[PDB]
Design a binder for this molecule. Structure first.
Ligand SMILES: Cc1cc2nc3c(=O)[nH]c(=O)nc-3n(C[C@H](O)[C@H](O)[C@H](O)COP(=O)(O)OP(=O)(O)OC[C@H]3O[C@@H](n4cnc5c(N)ncnc54)[C@H](O)[C@@H]3O)c2cc1C
Ligand SMILES: Cc1cc2nc3c(=O)[nH]c(=O)nc-3n(C[C@H](O)[C@H](O)[C@H](O)COP(=O)(O)OP(=O)(O)OC[C@H]3O[C@@H](n4cnc5c(N)ncnc54)[C@H](O)[C@@H]3O)c2cc1C
Ligand SMILES: O=c1ccn([C@@H]2O[C@H](COP(=O)(O)OP(=O)(O)O[C@H]3O[C@H](CO)[C@H](O)[C@H](O)[C@H]3O)[C@@H](O)[C@H]2O)c(=O)[nH]1
Ligand SMILES: O=c1ccn([C@@H]2O[C@H](COP(=O)(O)OP(=O)(O)O[C@H]3O[C@H](CO)[C@H](O)[C@H](O)[C@H]3O)[C@@H](O)[C@H]2O)c(=O)[nH]1
Lengths: 363, 365
């Protein structure tokens, strides 16, 4: 071989799906990551005690797309799992998303599904145009439930009030009149049976894929031959922050192991109103691993650190537009992924995006 | 005229490559380390299996050394679980200590020798050999022909596809005969396993910012276009020189992994089978790792003539062939050869580490 058809930057879902697709169509692919491991944020591994964990926070796979689910199925088997989260509020562990039981338990009511609908209507606030993260919630369940479940959590997570964020943020967590307590109502809910990393290895295993780790693309870009680049990192950095830093929100993770089989009643407990952390997660709930000990992770929001979240709001959408135009003009570069196109995407969404990009590149 | 690129391209991420990658990196050299396998660690790589048991995909690796410096060097990259490996040989339907010792002899023949008598006993069955050269010679001249047939001949024939008469003495000489009651497989000063396994240790070794790690990559797919100033090669020597003198024999293995629904399958880390079955041995990883788990994973090793090279085959016809490749190696301007495969040496892990450290001091001189 004398070079590569593609240099792919980042070995998370965005990069790896494209690597898999290009390589299976005959292309020579070099995939690179500044991190010492593949998988990006979805990387998993065994900790010191032998528990399978997610070093970058709990990643629960879920999708409504049959195509996405069947695509991933090529690379892993599944453990069925429907994630459930409780919120700590007024000293109780209550379902989030808010549902019938959340409301009845919180206030000691005995409303039926039909009645809880009118109760919501009786407390809701009228908003002419729903635009912010405050609007979406307050206009649906009213001020008190907003205060109890969203305001505090949102401020802690983003360093911003919900009125300061686009509606699309808090609207991720739909409110319900029914008694569904799953965090997701997606059609397909399941975890890679032996974890994500195993899945990524299968994904990246073709002979046409060379993997370079612990490596910034800029370190090798001058002297490795390649026709096209797929970039999945932060956009602002790609253009040397020429228009200023595009805000991304970060996280610090405090992992702990405990000498019992179970610490929590569910996979994740949220803390809208207490503590420095937004939530704790316990991995055995998610992986189904059996073990005599247990490992959990506490997440603390951070203004600095590796970028994990775009911050959806008008001034950032605007700043992003500028970077987007440089991106659109970059000739032999395709931008794809949560960080690179500045979209608050779920794993399955990134997969679909990568798949659609491959089709265009081909197709 | 062209990009100088990396100071060193290192082929293979086993002990040989990784130790040199770490040393060169710490001195400020830019390193690209490549392996055709999809993981680091060479033969010593370990990982958790489908059941969550820590295993060694390429057979049991027990760390042991007499070198305090090798032990301390590695200690920079891992903590340790103390462990002294013990092997039992299946002979006459009993599980007996190998290396052969006092208890082995007493139990096998129904004797009651003391340590002072078993020496005299050995003396009385030993065959003399004016010059020891063969793997047959080393054994038969110390413990005689019956003990040789029971513990060594069959195992050796099965492992190498050669009779011990066709191997250099150094192969069977690896397993000393004892007149004491020591049942450890090794008597080395430092015996201990990387607390969280080899892979974790290797990851720490290759963590430097000056180290770029390329997996799933034959160096040959890369060497035409990636600029490097010097090469460190740790693969088989014959292949490097396009088998221009014919195939250098390396012995291979096939591994069959199993997980059983019990806490413990075997009484020790490894049971050898000199006289039974197609496999040479079974090993049970929890003995070696100290891992706690409600199931257990084991591996059976089948000797293969064909496949990835794991052992040089020490005997005169092969040392002959290697000598020729070695002259080519010594002459190759910007390439240095290191490790079990590249220098055709039947080395344990610690010896490869020592080789790599010594090569580093030479490069730096
Ligand atoms: C705490 C947390 C929980 C989450 N939970 C879920 C969940 O439960 N369910 C769900 O569906 N999704 C979840 N996600 C989101 C999910 O992680 C994303 O969809 C996923 O990250 C998308 O992958 P990606 O390829 O776009 O980016 P990434 O995973 O971030 O990968 C991009 C890669 O690019 C690399 N890179 C950047 N710059 C360079 C450079 N210069 N050189 C080399 N490499 C570079 C990075 O190191 C990175 O690994 C969660 C995310 C977080 C942070
Ligand atoms: C079954 C078995 C059991 C063992 N048990 C013990 C033990 O108990 N105790 C002990 O001390 N030692 C043990 N060893 C010995 C130990 O494996 C070796 O000393 C050590 O692993 C060798 O290190 P290395 O770097 O020299 O070679 P390797 O581990 O073999 O690594 C060389 C690397 O180079 C790579 N390579 C080769 N060609 C290319 C190419 N062209 N392109 C890219 N990469 C290439 C290979 O993939 C390989 O990973 C055992 C060995 C085996 C096989
Ligand atoms: O109890 C809550 C939960 C959410 N929110 C608000 O709604 C937003 C979106 O909530 P997410 O649960 O989607 O937050 P994350 O992205 O940080 O969490 C990640 O891990 C979660 C646990 O699985 C979910 O899967 C989620 O989809 C996944 O992206 C939060 O930022 C916040 O503004 C709350 O105010 N209170
Ligand atoms: O029961 C035996 C043991 C050894 N031998 C002979 O002596 C040789 C060298 O024996 P090794 O035990 O060193 O064989 P290995 O290199 O294959 O074993 C590897 O795996 C082992 C784990 O059980 C030990 O850690 C050993 O040191 C490690 O290099 C064998 O090839 C064979 O010729 C026997 O004939 N019979």
């Amino acid at each position: 071989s004398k070079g590569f058809d593609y240099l792919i930057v980042g070995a998370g879902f965005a990069g790896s799906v494209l690597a898999e697709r290009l390589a299976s169509s005959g292309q020579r692919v070099l995939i690179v990551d500044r991190r010492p491991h593949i998988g990006g944020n979805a990387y998993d591994c065994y900790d010191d005690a032998g528990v399978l964990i997610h070093p970058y926070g709990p990643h629960i796979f879920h999708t409504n797309s049959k195509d996405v689910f069947e695509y991933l199925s090529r690379f892993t088997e599944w453990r069925p799992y429907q994630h459930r989260v409780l919120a700590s509020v007024d000293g109780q562990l209550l379902p989030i998303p808010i549902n019938l039981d959340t409301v009845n338990r919180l206030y000691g009511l005995n409303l039926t599904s039909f009645q809880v609908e009118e109760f919501f209507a009786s407390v809701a606030e009228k908003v002419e145009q729903v635009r912010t993260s405050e609007d979406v919630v307050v206009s649906k369940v009213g001020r008190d439930l907003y205060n109890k479940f969203f305001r505090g959590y949102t401020r802690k997570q983003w360093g911003l009030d919900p009125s300061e964020l686009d509606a699309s943020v808090t609207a991720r967590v739909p409110t319900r009149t029914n008694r569904d307590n799953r965090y997701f109502a997606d059609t397909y809910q399941a975890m890679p049976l032996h974890g994500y990393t195993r899945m990524f290895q299968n994904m990246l295993s073709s002979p046409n894929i060379k993997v370079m780790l612990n490596t910034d693309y800029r370190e090798i870009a001058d002297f490795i031959p390649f026709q096209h680049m797929i970039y999945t990192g932060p956009v602002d950095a790609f253009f040397d922050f020429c228009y200023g830093k595009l805000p991304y929100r970060s996280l610090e993770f405090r992992h702990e192991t405990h000498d019992t089989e179970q610490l929590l009643p569910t996979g994740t407990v949220n803390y809208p109103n207490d503590y420095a952390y937004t939530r704790v997660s316990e991995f055995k709930h998610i992986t189904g691993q059996r073990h005599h000990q247990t490992s959990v992770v506490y997440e603390y929001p951070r203004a600095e650190g590796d970028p994990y979240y775009p911050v959806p709001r008008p001034e950032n959408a605007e700043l992003y537009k500028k970077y987007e135009a440089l991106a659109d003009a970059a000739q032999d570069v395709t931008f794809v992924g949560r960080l690179a196109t500045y979209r608050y995407y779920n794993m399955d969404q990134v997969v679909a995006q990568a798949l659609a990009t491959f089709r265009r590149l081909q197709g």
